Amino acid sequence: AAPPLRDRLSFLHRLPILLKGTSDDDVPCPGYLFEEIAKISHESPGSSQCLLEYLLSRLHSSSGHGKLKVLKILLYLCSHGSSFFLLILKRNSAFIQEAAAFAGPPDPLHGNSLYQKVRAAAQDLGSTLFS
Amino acid sequence: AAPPLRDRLSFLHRLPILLKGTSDDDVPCPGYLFEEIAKISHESPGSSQCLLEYLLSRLHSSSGHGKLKVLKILLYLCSHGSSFFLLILKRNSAFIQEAAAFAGPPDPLHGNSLYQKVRAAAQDLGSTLFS
Amino acid sequence: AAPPLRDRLSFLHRLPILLKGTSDDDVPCPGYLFEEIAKISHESPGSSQCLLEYLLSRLHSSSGHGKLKVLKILLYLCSHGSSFFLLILKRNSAFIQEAAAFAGPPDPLHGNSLYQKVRAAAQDLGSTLFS
Amino acid sequence: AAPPLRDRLSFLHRLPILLKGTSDDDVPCPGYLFEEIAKISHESPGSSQCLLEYLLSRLHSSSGHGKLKVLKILLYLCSHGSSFFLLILKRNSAFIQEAAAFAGPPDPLHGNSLYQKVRAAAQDLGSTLFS
């Protein structure tokens, strides 16, 4: 049930898209990359499996900037991703309450705004995915 | 046997409670949050599963300050949490000897007091949970 | 199906080879160590299992310098390693898209060149292994 | 087959011994603690399971100082620990080649001596355990 190698290779060729869309920085992700990422989820079930692995990996390893981007991407996929992608997202959704607990020391310039944005995005994702 | 999504969503709505109760800082957790957390454990078995995931995640990722809070919360749940919560806590109790081994460099102001507090709380939890 | 202990011990005796070949530094790996590592993969199936464990561990724990070396070694093994090694590499190939996502802050002297080299090596490995 | 809770509790009461024996510092472990740790392994199979969990956790989380202590303790247990402990150690022995790969930046005062000591202890453990 794991992705066939042909799907792993197709997905590798898509990584320029995803690298820009989830870059761990304060530059908002542009709209066209949301559209491209939803298109990736529809390529095949194996493409969707690879995409979930990738997005959850980025969510774990990124600072709040990249975490926020992943959570926004997942929220968009709730409305435009494939049915199979949303199924495996629901089956692997224990991460949402962890994203909703993201916290740390406040920034002298921005306070806790970034943490609050990440937690709010996780709450919105949970409300959408779980209702 | 994993939590249904309706329980994951209910639990998300409780996270303000838990975020304050386990905040990774030197401010003691107030009594009313112990009571609220025990109430969460009684909501449903799925709520208890989510709660265990959350508390063990906080125990792993926090400094000694948050570790101590989680261990005190778990000790309180030994006397006031649901039967199902204490069952799954007992089934997942290998972490206690790890908490009881918490150590690190001494603080110039407070010495090893924080490590000693964490280890003592883990020992008390083990004595309560395992007897 | 895990390696017998005799194979674990033989592999330990090979670690001087692998330690030099994957050292986490900017000194390129010399050609003779590629040859020696391919020879290790042919010693036995258990030797190949140990070798995969080792290379994937180094890939995870190293800076970009050691990551690049591991990815070059794996690419060489695609052309000269044992059939069993390439089978278990294919079965454990989810790491490739993670290596192909390697990124971080740019270097004032070298920019993003190291990240780009790692990602390019991961793409080449995927193209070779998955086609 | 996991340890009963009575064994988890007995083991908690032994942690003062193990905390001193594996302390992550440059003070050699005294001989009497080797003897006490071997005695712990003989208390019961569950005590041995807890002991393995503890020692492997310390091996993973410690600097080279604590890693070296754990590897010396395990070598001693090869000659004086219980039969059950050595069985489960052999079943969980993939860590040895990872310890035998321990490396890092050299120390201006001590060079690579610590890494070399850890790797040599891992090689000795493997030679003893695997032969």
Side-chain angles (χ1 to χ4, degrees):
Chain A
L5 301 186
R6 58 169 175 275
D7 292 350
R8 291 233 174 251
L9 181 58
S10 297
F11 186 79
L12 278 184
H13 296 163
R14 312 292 186 276
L15 273 180
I17 295 169
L18 297 148
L19 293 183
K20 184 175 180 184
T22 64
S23 61
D24 191 6
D25 56 56
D26 63 359
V27 181
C29 180
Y32 82 92
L33 288 175
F34 287 90
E35 296 170 340
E36 291 287 352
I37 293 174
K39 183 171 179 180
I40 293 172
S41 83
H42 287 274
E43 290 188 25
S44 70
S47 302
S48 271
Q49 297 177 288
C50 292
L51 177 63
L52 181 69
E53 291 180 8
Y54 174 88
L55 291 172
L56 297 190
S57 299
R58 296 307 106 232
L59 186 54
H60 187 73
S61 64
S62 292
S63 82
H65 293 291
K67 294 192 195 301
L68 182 55
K69 291 187 183 181
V70 169
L71 292 167
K72 286 175 170 172
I73 290 165
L74 291 167
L75 190 67
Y76 184 87
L77 289 166
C78 287
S79 294
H80 303 109
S82 72
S83 62
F84 183 78
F85 179 83
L86 294 175
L87 172 63
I88 60 171
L89 179 61
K90 289 180 187 173
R91 306 220 85 103
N92 292 277
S93 54
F95 70 90
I96 296 182
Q97 63 180 59
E98 282 295 289
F102 182 58
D107 184 84
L109 268 48
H110 305 110
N112 296 311
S113 58
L114 180 58
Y115 307 111
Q116 293 167 354
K117 288 178 176 63
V118 171
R119 293 198 301 260
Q123 291 282 348
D124 289 347
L125 177 57
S127 297
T128 297
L129 187 68
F130 294 151
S131 292
Chain B
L5 301 186
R6 58 169 175 275
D7 292 350
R8 291 233 174 251
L9 181 58
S10 297
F11 186 79
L12 278 184
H13 296 163
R14 312 292 186 276
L15 273 180
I17 295 169
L18 297 148
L19 293 183
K20 184 175 180 184
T22 64
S23 61
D24 191 6
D25 56 56
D26 63 359
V27 181
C29 180
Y32 82 92
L33 288 175
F34 287 90
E35 296 170 340
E36 291 287 352
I37 293 174
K39 183 171 179 180
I40 293 172
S41 83
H42 287 274
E43 290 188 25
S44 70
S47 302
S48 271
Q49 297 177 288
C50 292
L51 177 63
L52 181 69
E53 291 180 8
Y54 174 88
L55 291 172
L56 297 190
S57 299
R58 296 307 106 232
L59 186 54
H60 187 73
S61 64
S62 292
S63 82
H65 293 291
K67 294 192 195 301
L68 182 55
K69 291 187 183 181
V70 169
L71 292 167
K72 286 175 170 172
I73 290 165
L74 291 167
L75 190 67
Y76 184 87
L77 289 166
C78 287
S79 294
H80 303 109
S82 72
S83 62
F84 183 78
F85 179 83
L86 294 175
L87 172 63
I88 60 171
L89 179 61
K90 289 180 187 173
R91 306 220 85 103
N92 292 277
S93 54
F95 70 90
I96 296 182
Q97 63 180 59
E98 282 295 289
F102 182 58
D107 184 84
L109 268 48
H110 305 110
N112 296 311
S113 58
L114 180 58
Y115 307 111
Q116 293 167 354
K117 288 178 176 63
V118 171
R119 293 198 301 260
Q123 291 282 348
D124 289 347
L125 177 57
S127 297
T128 297
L129 187 68
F130 294 151
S131 292
Chain C
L5 301 186
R6 58 169 175 275
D7 292 350
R8 291 233 174 251
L9 181 58
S10 297
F11 186 79
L12 278 184
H13 296 163
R14 312 292 186 276
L15 273 180
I17 295 169
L18 297 148
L19 293 183
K20 184 175 180 184
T22 64
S23 61
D24 191 6
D25 56 56
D26 63 359
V27 181
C29 180
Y32 82 92
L33 288 175
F34 287 90
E35 296 170 340
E36 291 287 352
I37 293 174
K39 183 171 179 180
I40 293 172
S41 83
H42 287 274
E43 290 188 25
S44 70
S47 302
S48 271
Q49 297 177 288
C50 292
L51 177 63
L52 181 69
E53 291 180 8
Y54 174 88
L55 291 172
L56 297 190
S57 299
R58 296 307 106 232
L59 186 54
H60 187 73
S61 64
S62 292
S63 82
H65 293 291
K67 294 192 195 301
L68 182 55
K69 291 187 183 181
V70 169
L71 292 167
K72 286 175 170 172
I73 290 165
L74 291 167
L75 190 67
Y76 184 87
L77 289 166
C78 287
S79 294
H80 303 109
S82 72
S83 62
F84 183 78
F85 179 83
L86 294 175
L87 172 63
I88 60 171
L89 179 61
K90 289 180 187 173
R91 306 220 85 103
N92 292 277
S93 54
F95 70 90
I96 296 182
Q97 63 180 59
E98 282 295 289
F102 182 58
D107 184 84
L109 268 48
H110 305 110
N112 296 311
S113 58
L114 180 58
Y115 307 111
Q116 293 167 354
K117 288 178 176 63
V118 171
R119 293 198 301 260
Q123 291 282 348
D124 289 347
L125 177 57
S127 297
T128 297
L129 187 68
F130 294 151
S131 292
Chain D
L5 301 186
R6 58 169 175 275
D7 292 350
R8 291 233 174 251
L9 181 58
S10 297
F11 186 79
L12 278 184
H13 296 163
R14 312 292 186 276
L15 273 180
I17 295 169
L18 297 148
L19 293 183
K20 184 175 180 184
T22 64
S23 61
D24 191 6
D25 56 56
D26 63 359
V27 181
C29 180
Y32 82 92
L33 288 175
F34 287 90
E35 296 170 340
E36 291 287 352
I37 293 174
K39 183 171 179 180
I40 293 172
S41 83
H42 287 274
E43 290 188 25
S44 70
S47 302
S48 271
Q49 297 177 288
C50 292
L51 177 63
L52 181 69
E53 291 180 8
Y54 174 88
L55 291 172
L56 297 190
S57 299
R58 296 307 106 232
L59 186 54
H60 187 73
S61 64
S62 292
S63 82
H65 293 291
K67 294 192 195 301
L68 182 55
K69 291 187 183 181
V70 169
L71 292 167
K72 286 175 170 172
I73 290 165
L74 291 167
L75 190 67
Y76 184 87
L77 289 166
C78 287
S79 294
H80 303 109
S82 72
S83 62
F84 183 78
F85 179 83
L86 294 175
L87 172 63
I88 60 171
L89 179 61
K90 289 180 187 173
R91 306 220 85 103
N92 292 277
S93 54
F95 70 90
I96 296 182
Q97 63 180 59
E98 282 295 289
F102 182 58
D107 184 84
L109 268 48
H110 305 110
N112 296 311
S113 58
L114 180 58
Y115 307 111
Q116 293 167 354
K117 288 178 176 63
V118 171
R119 293 198 301 260
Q123 291 282 348
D124 289 347
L125 177 57
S127 297
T128 297
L129 187 68
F130 294 151
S131 292

Short mmCIF file of all heavy atoms in Angstrom, two decimals, chain A residues 26 105-115 117:
data_model
loop_
_atom_site.label_atom_id
_atom_site.label_comp_id
_atom_site.label_asym_id
_atom_site.label_seq_id
_atom_site.Cartn_x
_atom_site.Cartn_y
_atom_site.Cartn_z
N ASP A 26 9.47 34.05 6.26
CA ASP A 26 8.32 34.91 6.51
C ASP A 26 7.68 35.45 5.23
O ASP A 26 6.84 36.36 5.31
CB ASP A 26 8.72 36.08 7.42
CG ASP A 26 9.77 37.00 6.80
OD1 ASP A 26 10.22 36.73 5.67
OD2 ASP A 26 10.14 37.99 7.46
N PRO A 105 9.28 31.22 23.48
CA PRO A 105 9.55 32.54 24.05
C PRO A 105 9.06 33.64 23.14
O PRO A 105 9.15 33.53 21.90
CB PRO A 105 11.08 32.55 24.17
CG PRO A 105 11.55 31.62 23.10
CD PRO A 105 10.50 30.54 23.02
N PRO A 106 8.54 34.74 23.69
CA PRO A 106 8.01 35.81 22.85
C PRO A 106 9.12 36.58 22.15
O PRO A 106 10.26 36.66 22.63
CB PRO A 106 7.26 36.70 23.83
CG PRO A 106 7.98 36.52 25.11
CD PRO A 106 8.46 35.08 25.13
N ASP A 107 8.78 37.13 21.01
CA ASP A 107 9.72 37.93 20.23
C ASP A 107 9.67 39.38 20.70
O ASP A 107 8.57 39.92 20.89
CB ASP A 107 9.38 37.86 18.75
CG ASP A 107 10.39 38.58 17.89
OD1 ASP A 107 11.43 37.98 17.55
OD2 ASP A 107 10.16 39.76 17.56
N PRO A 108 10.81 40.05 20.91
CA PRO A 108 10.75 41.44 21.39
C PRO A 108 10.00 42.37 20.46
O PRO A 108 9.45 43.38 20.91
CB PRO A 108 12.22 41.84 21.51
CG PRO A 108 12.97 40.57 21.59
CD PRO A 108 12.20 39.58 20.77
N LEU A 109 9.97 42.05 19.16
CA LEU A 109 9.30 42.88 18.17
C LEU A 109 7.87 42.43 17.90
O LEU A 109 6.97 43.27 17.78
CB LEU A 109 10.09 42.87 16.86
CG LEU A 109 11.13 43.98 16.66
CD1 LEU A 109 12.02 44.12 17.87
CD2 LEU A 109 11.97 43.70 15.42
N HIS A 110 7.63 41.12 17.79
CA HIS A 110 6.34 40.59 17.38
C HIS A 110 5.61 39.83 18.49
O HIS A 110 4.55 39.26 18.24
CB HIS A 110 6.52 39.68 16.16
CG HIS A 110 7.23 40.34 15.02
ND1 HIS A 110 8.51 40.00 14.65
CD2 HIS A 110 6.84 41.34 14.19
CE1 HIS A 110 8.88 40.75 13.62
NE2 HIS A 110 7.89 41.57 13.32
N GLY A 111 6.15 39.82 19.70
CA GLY A 111 5.47 39.14 20.79
C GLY A 111 5.25 37.67 20.48
O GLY A 111 6.15 36.97 20.00
N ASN A 112 4.04 37.19 20.76
CA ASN A 112 3.69 35.80 20.53
C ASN A 112 2.89 35.61 19.24
O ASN A 112 2.31 34.55 19.03
CB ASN A 112 2.91 35.25 21.72
CG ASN A 112 3.74 35.23 22.98
OD1 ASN A 112 4.87 34.74 22.99
ND2 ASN A 112 3.19 35.77 24.06
N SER A 113 2.88 36.63 18.37
CA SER A 113 1.98 36.61 17.22
C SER A 113 2.18 35.37 16.36
O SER A 113 1.20 34.79 15.87
CB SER A 113 2.18 37.87 16.37
OG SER A 113 3.53 37.97 15.95
N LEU A 114 3.42 34.94 16.15
CA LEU A 114 3.66 33.80 15.27
C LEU A 114 3.07 32.53 15.87
O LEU A 114 2.38 31.77 15.18
CB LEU A 114 5.15 33.63 15.01
CG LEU A 114 5.52 32.46 14.09
CD1 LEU A 114 4.86 32.57 12.73
CD2 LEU A 114 7.03 32.36 13.93
N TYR A 115 3.34 32.28 17.15
CA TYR A 115 2.74 31.13 17.81
C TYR A 115 1.23 31.18 17.71
O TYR A 115 0.58 30.16 17.42
CB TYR A 115 3.16 31.09 19.29
CG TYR A 115 4.64 31.15 19.52
CD1 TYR A 115 5.23 32.27 20.08
CD2 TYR A 115 5.45 30.07 19.19
CE1 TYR A 115 6.60 32.32 20.31
CE2 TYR A 115 6.81 30.11 19.41
CZ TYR A 115 7.38 31.23 19.97
OH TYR A 115 8.74 31.26 20.18
N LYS A 117 -0.60 32.64 15.46
CA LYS A 117 -1.01 32.34 14.08
C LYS A 117 -0.97 30.85 13.80
O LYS A 117 -1.89 30.30 13.18
CB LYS A 117 -0.13 33.09 13.10
CG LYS A 117 -0.36 34.58 13.05
CD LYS A 117 0.60 35.23 12.07
CE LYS A 117 0.34 36.72 11.91
NZ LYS A 117 0.55 37.46 13.19
#
